[PDB]
Design a protein around this nucleic acid. Structure first.
Lengths: 145, 145
DNA sequence: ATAATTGTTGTCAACAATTAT
DNA sequence: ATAATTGTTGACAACAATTAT
């Protein structure tokens, strides 16, 4: 089913989930920055999650799209504390009120222009929910040096 | 807890918070049924909390009112598991996204007509959010024997 | 350098037990 | 009987360490 996942994502955000995330084959690997793809998220919970994550984050950007084929949302989170996938997998699964089977968690692709812009383009749209100062790896890759 | 909380509560629900709760002077005392009074609760979180509590409850009834002096909501929760006040105090404080200083947690007054009806009257209003079968101590005290 | 792996510690919910009102 | 008190156990997040790519 993971196949129908990525396909749906790319379909809504016009770019492969991979083009914005590096791999972490171990759910125990800890890290602060995480990219989250959610499916079937309820509007209310989306709004809610925002406020709750602000408390424990340095930066946070949320976007949500949908259509007659299914809904989805993306999260760029910078937890004040390093969290393993399990840790996050648990925290969010509950916070968003969705089964784990509806979550894709991979660290961001901090080294890549294509990616770095995806976050910028979003930070432009008003629909997007932002909080905190843009991560360094993002501002740098998107500014005339 | 504080003058404000009560005075405001009684003001909105037309009855002293005491008339529907028995005392528990120890935050460690465990129990399944809890009455919760919240203040400054955000609409979104109210709606959210509902769905999240259903997962871990046998029964649940939520009501919310307000006015140009303050807002307030009441919760009658029947956790599938016995929880100390601390436990609940923590769970909700976060779930509702409000500081503990904005919560009054006392077990329900399972023996008292005046009280038993408060829950019934509410279960009548459509505005109220209900889930599960009415607690025994409630149906019994509100039915022609 | 990056992250897969393994292990240690602190916090807290689930829960047993014992005393006191 | 009810609940104030104290204590035990299990799950898990925060975090140190060590190996492997």
């Amino acid at each position: 089913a993971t196949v129908f996942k990525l396909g749906l994502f790319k379909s809504l955000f016009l770019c492969s989930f991979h083009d914005i995330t590096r791999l972490f084959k171990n759910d125990k690997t800890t890290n602060q920055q995480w990219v989250l793809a959610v499916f079937g998220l309820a509007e209310v919970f989306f709004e809610a999650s925002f406020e709750l994550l602000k408390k424990q984050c340095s930066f946070l950007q949320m976007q949500k799209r949908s259509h007659e084929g299914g809904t989805c949302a993306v999260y760029l989170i910078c937890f004040n504390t390093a969290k393993s996938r399990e840790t996050v997998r648990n925290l969010m699964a509950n916070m968003l009120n969705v089964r784990e089977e509806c979550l894709m968690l991979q660290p961001p692709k901090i080294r890549g222009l294509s990616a770095a812009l995806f976050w910028f383009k979003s930070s432009l749209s008003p629909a997007t929910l932002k909080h905190g100062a843009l991560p360094e790896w993002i501002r740098a890759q998107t500014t005339l040096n």
